[PDB]
Design a protein around this ligand. Structure first.
Ligand SMILES: [Zn+2]
Lengths: 222, 641
C-alpha cells in the first residue's frame, strides 16, 4: 500500500487550496486529522487505523469573491464551524483601497518584477537550508510552563470566553473561543519558548499569543 | 572439552549451569533489577507439574539475566535457540530424575522415561518490528506485537515415509532426513533383488501439522513515511486453534528465510529469498487491558483442555487480592472513584464517564433453550459542542479495550464492513477476509462523524443493533455470522454553534428512529461560566507543568491494574438475576418518561443490571433503577425545555 497526498507526509507539512471546492469526503477525513493524527478506513483489504502525524494548511475564498461587509464572517464564509472549531487560527484577508498604501505596494510589486531581488533593505533573509537547520535544532527542546504564566493564561481564557459569548453574538462575531483555543495558545507559547531556546516559559510571550489572536480579525471592523 | 562445529555451545556444561540456576533462583530479579516473602521462584513449577503429566514449560529471559551463572546462557539460547533447546529438553529430564532421587513414589516411572519435554521463552528482549532484520541477524529468538487478519488450514508433511515393496509380502520404512525422503529403490536384495521395484502409500505414513497466519504489525516506533506490512509465518502441531482473528497479540519466534519455485514444473529458483518466521511462543493476554468473555469461548476452552495444550486463555488471580477487592468494595465511594479514575487528565464529565464504565461492565448474557439470546452490549451515542474530549475519550476506550476497531467519516462501505472476498498474492487462489464489524465480536466498535457517513453504510446498522448477526449472500459465500461487539460513537450537531431553543430530537441532521434506538446518549453543551472553567484550566495545565502527569495521581485516583483485574473477575464470575422490587420503579419510570420508545426500557435494564454487577451483587435491586432513570434524564438534560 502507498498512500495519498497526506500519508506521504508525516511529521511534516501539507498545503491545500480551494478547500471550499473539495468534496464532503475530504472534509470527513480532515475533520479527523486536525484533532486526531489517525485515519480510519473500512473499504477493502485496507482496514487500518493509519498514522498521519501531519500539519494542515488550507485556503479558499468566500461565496461572493469579495467580502460582504454587511454580513458576518460566520455567514459570508462557506465552511461550518462544526469543523472550524478545530481551526485554532483563522485569518480573514480582505482588501479595501487607500490612496497611500497601494503606492508603495506597487513600488514593491514593480521592483520585484523589475529584478527578482527583493527590496534592498539593510537585511539579508537567508536560505532554507540554514532555516531548516535552525528549525531542527529548536525542535530538540521540550520546555516547561511555570505557574506564574498559567494563572494569567487562565484569566485571559475566562475573559475571552465570557466576552465573546455575551458580547459577540452579533454582526462581526465568529462563534466562541474554546478549550482548543487555550490549548493552541499553550502550544504556541511553548513554541515561543522553543525559539528563545529556554526550557521554561516567560510571561512575556502569552501577550504575543493573544495579541496575534485578536489581531487576526482587525480588518473586520474597518 | 565438547563443542559443536561453528559453535561455542557445550551440552553438559549447559546442563550443569542450567541445573544450578534451577536449584538456585529465588526472586533474584526483584533484588538485582529493582528494590522490590517467598523462595525458589522456579522450582515450584517443577515440583507441581509432575502428577499432571504435561510435556511443556514456559520460561523468561530475565531470570537468566538476574542469576549470576546465566548471563552467558542468554546470548547462546539467543543465537542457537533450537540447539540450546535440544540441549535443555535433555537437561530438563536430567534435572527431573536428579530431583526424583530424593523421593520415593508410586510407580509413575512407566511414563517419564517415555516422555519428551519442551520449553517456551516468552518475555524476551524487545525487537523493532520487521525492518530491523537485515540479513545479519536471521534465525534468532525474536519478539513482536501485533494483530490478526487471516488463518490458513492445516499443512500435513511426511513424517514416516512408509514404503510398500511390490513382492515378498514385505513392507519397508524410512524417515525424513533434513526434510526429504530418499526412496529406497531396491527390493531388499536378500529376499528379492529388483533394484527399483517399490511403491508408496499415504494412508500409512505419519503426518505433521503446520499452519500459517497472516498478521498485521503494530510497532511502538516508525520512521518518516511508514505504513503497514502483512507477514506470514509457521506454527506447528499442539499449537493449532490458538490464535485467530479478533486478537491483539504479543509473540515470539524465529526470523528465517526460504526460496520458492519458479513454477510447478522444474527446480529453478529465485535469487531473492522469501522471508518468514517459525514460532516459539505466543502471548494472548497482557496487563493493560481486560480479556474475553469467559462464556463466549467455552468450546475453545474445553478443546484446549482435550488437546492438552494450555497456553493461556484467561488471566489468573490471587486470593489476597480477592480479599483486597472485597475490601475495596465495602466502601461507598465506588460510584465516583471509578469515574475519577477512568480519565484523570480530564475534567468532570461524571455521568459520561460512569456510563463508559457501565458499558465496560456490559451487562447480561442470557440465552434460551434453542430460540433466544440476549447479549451484554448497549449501543451508545455522544453529541454536543466540539472542542472537548469526546474524541480523546474514544481513543482512550479503543486503546484500553482489547477487541475493537476505529472508523471515521464517509470513508467506509458495506463491502468493507460485512464480508469481502479477495485473492492471495502467493497462492493466487480465492481466499476471504473478515470484516471490521465482526472483528470486534465482543468489545468495542468505535466511530467518529456519524452524520456525514453514507446512507449505504448507515443502512447496515439496523440489524446489528438488535441481533449481533450480519448476513451475507455474495460469491460462493452464504453464512449468517455473529458480531457481538458493542457500539460507541459520536454525532455532530445540525449546522454549527448550536440552536439552544429547538427540539434537539430535530436539531441534529439525523432522523428519529436511528437516534431513539440508541440505549443512551450524552450531551456536551457549553454553559459557559466560571466555577467550571478555571478549575478545568488548571486541571489541564498542571498536566503540562510536568513531563508526564504522575502528580495527577492526587485527589484519590486508583491504578489501572487492580482496577482492570477487579473488572475482569467481575465480568467473569457474577450473574445478577433480575429482582421483583425493581419492576414497579422501572415501569413507572419508562411510562412517565414516554412523555421516546420501548428500547430505552431495554437500555435501563441492561444498564441497571450492570449497576448490580458493580458493587459485586449477584442480584439487581430497586435502587439501581433509581440512578438509572436519574442519570438518563440527566443525560438528555430534561429540565431545560
Ligand atoms: Zn520384494
Amino acid at each position: 500500500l502507498e498512500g495519498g497526498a497526506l500519508v506521504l507526509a508525516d511529521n511534516g507539512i501539507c498545503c491545500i487550496d480551494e478547500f471550499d471546492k473539495m468534496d464532503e469526503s475530504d472534509r470527513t477525513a480532515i475533520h479527523e486529522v486536525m484533532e486526531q493524527q489517525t485515519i480510519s478506513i473500512s473499504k477493502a483489504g485496507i482496514n487500518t487505523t493509519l498514522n498521519a502525524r501531519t500539519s494542515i494548511l488550507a485556503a479558499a475564498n468566500p461565496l461572493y469573491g469579495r467580502y460582504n461587509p454587511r454580513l458576518s464572517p460566520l455567514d459570508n464564509i462557506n465552511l461550518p464551524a462544526a469543523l472550524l472549531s478545530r481551526f485554532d487560527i483563522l485569518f480573514l484577508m480582505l482588501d479595501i483601497p487607500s490612496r497611500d498604501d497601494d503606492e508603495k505596494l506597487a513600488e514593491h510589486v514593480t521592483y520585484v518584477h523589475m529584478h527578482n531581488k527583493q527590496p534592498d533593505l539593510d537585511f539579508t533573509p537567508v536560505e532554507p537550508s540554514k532555516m531548516r537547520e535552525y528549525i531542527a535544532y529548536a525542535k530538540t527542546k521540550r520546555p516547561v510552563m511555570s505557574e506564574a504564566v498559567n494563572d494569567y493564561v487562565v484569566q485571559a481564557y475566562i475573559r475571552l470566553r465570557q466576552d465573546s459569548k455575551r458580547e459577540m453574538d452579533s454582526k462581526f462575531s465568529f462563534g466562541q473561543a474554546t478549550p482548543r483555543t487555550l490549548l493552541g495558545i499553550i502550544r504556541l507559547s511553548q513554541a515561543l519558548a522553543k525559539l528563545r531556546l529556554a526550557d521554561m516559559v516567560d510571561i512575556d510571550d502569552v501577550e504575543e499569543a493573544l495579541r496575534l489572536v485578536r489581531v487576526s480579525k482587525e480588518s473586520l471592523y474597518q | 572439552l565438547r563443542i559443536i562445529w561453528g559453535t561455542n555451545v557445550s551440552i553438559q556444561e549447559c546442563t550443569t549451569n542450567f541445573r544450578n540456576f534451577l536449584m538456585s533462583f529465588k526472586y533474584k530479579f526483584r533484588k538485582i533489577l529493582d528494590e522490590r516473602d517467598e523462595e525458589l521462584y522456579y522450582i515450584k513449577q517443577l515440583n507441581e507439574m509432575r502428577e499432571l503429566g504435561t510435556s511443556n514449560l514456559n520460561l523468561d529471559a530475565r531470570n537468566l539475566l538476574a542469576y549470576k551463572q546465566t548471563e552467558d546462557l542468554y546470548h547462546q539460547l539467543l543465537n542457537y535457540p533450537q540447539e540450546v533447546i535440544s540441549i535443555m529438553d535433555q537437561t530438563i529430564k536430567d534435572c527431573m530424575v536428579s530431583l526424583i532421587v530424593d523421593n520415593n513414589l508410586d510407580y509413575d516411572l512407566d511414563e517419564i522415561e517415555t516422555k519428551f519435554y519442551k520449553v517456551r521463552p516468552y518475555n524476551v528482549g524487545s525487537c523493532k518490528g520487521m525492518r530491523e532484520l537485515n540479513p545479519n541477524d536471521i534465525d534468532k529468538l525474536i519478539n513482536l506485537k501485533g494483530l490478526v487478519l487471516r488463518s490458513t488450514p492445516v499443512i500435513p508433511d511426511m513424517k514416516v515415509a512408509f514404503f510398500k515393496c511390490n513382492v515378498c509380502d514385505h513392507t519397508m520404512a524410512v524417515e525424513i532426513d533434513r526434510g526429504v525422503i530418499q526412496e529406497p529403490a531396491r527390493c531388499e536384495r536378500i529376499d528379492c533383488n529388483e533394484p527399483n521395484s517399490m511403491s508408496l502409500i499415504h494412508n500409512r505414513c505419519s503426518f505433521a501439522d503446520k499452519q500459517v497466519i497472516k498478521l498485521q504489525e503494530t510497532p511502538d516506533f516508525v520512521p518518516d513515511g511508514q505504513t503497514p506490512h502483512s507477514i506470514s509465518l509457521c506454527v506447528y502441531d499442539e499449537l493449532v486453534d490458538s490464535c485467530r482473528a479478533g486478537d491483539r497479540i504479543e509473540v515470539t519466534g524465529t526470523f528465517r528465510s526460504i526460496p520458492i519455485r519458479a513454477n510447478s514444473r522444474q527446480r529453478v529458483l529465485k535469487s531473492l529469498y522469501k522471508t518468514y518466521v517459525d514460532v516459539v511462543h505466543v502471548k494472548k493476554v497482557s496487563d493493560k487491558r481486560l480479556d474475553v468473555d469467559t462464556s463466549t469461548i467455552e468450546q475453545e476452552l474445553m478443546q484446549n483442555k482435550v488437546d492438552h495444550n494450555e497456553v493461556e486463555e484467561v488471566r489468573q488471580i490471587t486470593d489476597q487480592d480477592l480479599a483486597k477487592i472485597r475490601e475495596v468494595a465495602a466502601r461507598e465511594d465506588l460510584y465516583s472513584l471509578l469515574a475519577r479514575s477512568i480519565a484523570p487528565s480530564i475534567y468532570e464529565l461524571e455521568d459520561v464517564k460512569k456510563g463508559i464504565l457501565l458499558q465496560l461492565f456490559g451487562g447480561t448474557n442470557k440465552t434460551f433453550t434453542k430460540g433466544g439470546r440476549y447479549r451484554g452490549d448497549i449501543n451508545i451515542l455522544l453529541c454536543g459542542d466540539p472542542s472537548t474530549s469526546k474524541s480523546q475519550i474514544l481513543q482512550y476506550v479503543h486503546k484500553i479495550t482489547p477487541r475493537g476497531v476505529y472508523t471515521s467519516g464517509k470513508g467506509s462501505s458495506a463491502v468493507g464492513l460485512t464480508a469481502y472476498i479477495t485473492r492471495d498474492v502467493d497462492t493466487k487462489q480465492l481466499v476471504l477476509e473478515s470484516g471490521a464489524l465482526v472483528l470486534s465480536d465482543g468489545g468495542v466498535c468505535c466511530i467518529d462523524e456519524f452524520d456525514k457517513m453514507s446512507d449505504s453504510t448507515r443502512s447496515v446498522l439496523h440489524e446489528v443493533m438488535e441481533q449481533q448477526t450480519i448476513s451475507i449472500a455474495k460469491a460462493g459465500i452464504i453464512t449468517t455470522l455473529n458480531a457481538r461487539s458493542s457500539i460507541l460513537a459520536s454525532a455532530n450537531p445540525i449546522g454549527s454553534r448550536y440552536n439552544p431553543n429547538l427540539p434537539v430530537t430535530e436539531n441534529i441532521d439525523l432522523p428519529p428512529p436511528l437516534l431513539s434506538r440508541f440505549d443512551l446518549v450524552y450531551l456536551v453543551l457549553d454553559k459557559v461560566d466560571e466555577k467550571n472553567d478555571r478549575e478545568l484550566a488548571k486541571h489541564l495545565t498542571n498536566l503540562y507543568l510536568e513531563d508526564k502527569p504522575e502528580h495527577i495521581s492526587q485527589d484519590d485516583v486508583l491504578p489501572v491494574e487492580f482496577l482492570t483485574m477487579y473488572i475482569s473477575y467481575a465480568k467473569e464470575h457474577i450473574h445478577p438475576i433480575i429482582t421483583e422490587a425493581a419492576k414497579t420503579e422501572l415501569v413507572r419510570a419508562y411510562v412517565g418518561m414516554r412523555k421516546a420508545t420501548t428500547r430505552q426500557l431495554e437500555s435501563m435494564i441492561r444498564l441497571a443490571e450492570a449497576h448490580a454487577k458493580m458493587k459485586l451483587k449477584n442480584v439487581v435491586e430497586l435502587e439501581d433503577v433509581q440512578e438509572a432513570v436519574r442519570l438518563i434524564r440527566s443525560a438528555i438534560k430534561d429540565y431545560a425545555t
